Nucleic acid binder design. Structure first.
Lengths: 278, 278
RNA sequence: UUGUUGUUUUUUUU
């Protein structure tokens, strides 16, 4: 029922492979303060960092369980102020790893606590928030590995696959099978719903931009971006001109863009802002 | 243990999508007398035809069970007529014949074929299908009559490709036997080409204008190993970059292999070269 | 509709 603004990507990079700028599986994507694009390249067991234009800068990590090694890294997040890179690993490892902006290993934790990490983010106080699929848990860490909060949401979540937070201790979780974003507080109380069936079907990720606006991305037919206020009011809706392979994850860039990681081993950058027409 | 000549592809085309020159799943590839590249685009329920340089010419077929395609997975060309032989995988599991213009001619074999996994045509116009799981070879005439039929569960573990010479010898690539197995039309096992160490996990087989046997695999890099029909090794190549899972391969008379891959792209590798100056 | 492999892992839907 919504007439969506058409959009095309202005940037595309990546391909299959093990060399620099190549992926085996780009399961996770994140963006730092300088709009560098950080990608979890799972089956290469490494993290790759690109600039905002998709040029390879550097990589870190290799297959293993030792320090400075990764085993199936799937999601990434950035500590804004320090530029530290938060990495989650999939089961059987299911733990958090922290690397600094130079790709040096800092620490790892949460291995005995996490089961199926599926989304990760960091609030303005540096607390690390992980959402887990299947078991439907949310776990909040500090950067040294202490558990600050923990709660289940198996009552409200069917398939959680993305998470962000505002500065009011509200957690926005995209739910693939509920066709919407679910909002919680740090205590674990369900607050409200953003989007829903018919406008945000099968969401694959969620973002919060510098305006505090909530972006919900999905690939239900074309690639769609639906933008809301935190109270749930729709303010913008976009749709891609071409169809995309399965989408793993999305991240926001300060220029008003979404970085899209897809199963065709490529990343796409869509602009969701435009000039005001005369 | 074999020192392989390194190679790079000189042509690349295709991407994910439903439009012309886009694929959802390029499961099958074939080449006609004019080196047009014919692609089975399975989940789009269509066949797409490109010229030797990867330019889109035209498409035919749409989803359905009427005299339409439902999950076409392999293709072969009747050289003299330019007819396109199409197999559909289960549940349909039948052969369809289209002419060079993409016009439906006829369909057959629905009640006999179970799991078509490879198809080719001999110089007399007989259509040969190899089936995985059940390990069968079935030879049809162009009206749909079964001329020959035999099981090879004793010699085959995972057949995924087939070609023939003009001597009624059938060359079948076996993914889990790491070689090509040779049979006659009666079903007698004749000999083996390749083996463990040089043709691991073959994904297809070809016979070129010289009667030379090409075995393609993606066990690490993309490899081409070339033999005589008696099994003597004469050439061996390997790609400089790694590829996503490869569905199928076909030969171009200019001395190239067309490679269809799970990254929704086709690659053309040249396996001939200039003689260096001595 | 789908048996490639390329270290275990990966509930998107189309």
């Amino acid at each position: 029922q919504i007439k969506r603004q058409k959009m095309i990507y202005h940037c595309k990079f990546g391909e299959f492979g093990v060399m620099e700028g190549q992926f085996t599986e780009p399961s996770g994507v994140a963006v730092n303060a300088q709009n560098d694009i950080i990608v979890a390249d799972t089956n290469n067991h490494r993290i790759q960092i690109f600039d905002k234009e998709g040029r390879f800068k550097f990589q870190f990590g290799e297959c293993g369980k030792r320090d400075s090694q990764l085993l199936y890294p799937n999601r990434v997040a950035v500590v804004r102020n320090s530029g530290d890179i938060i990495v989650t690993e999939r089961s059987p490892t299911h733990q958090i790893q922290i690397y600094n902006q130079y790709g040096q290993f800092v620490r790892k934790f949460g291995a005995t606590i996490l089961q199926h990490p599926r989304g990760v983010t960091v609030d303005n106080k540096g607390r690390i928030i992980v959402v887990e699929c299947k078991v439907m848990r949310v776990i909040i860490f500090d950067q040294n590995g202490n558990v600050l909060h923990k709660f289940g949401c198996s009552k409200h979540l069917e398939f959680p696959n993305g998470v962000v937070v505002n500065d009011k201790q509200e957690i926005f979780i995209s739910d693939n099978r509920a066709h919407c974003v679910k909002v919680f507080n740090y205590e674990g109380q369900y607050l409200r719903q953003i989007g829903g069936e018919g406008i945000t079907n099968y969401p694959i990720g969620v973002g919060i931009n510098s305006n505090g606006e909530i972006l919900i991305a999905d690939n239900h037919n074309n690639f769609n971006l639906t933008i809301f206020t935190q109270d749930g009011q729709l303010i913008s809706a976009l749709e891609s001109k071409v169809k995309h392979a399965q989408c793993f994850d999305v991240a926001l860039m300060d220029d008003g863009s979404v970085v899209l990681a897809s199963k065709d081993y490529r990343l796409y950058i869509y602009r969701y802002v435009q000039l005001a027409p005369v």
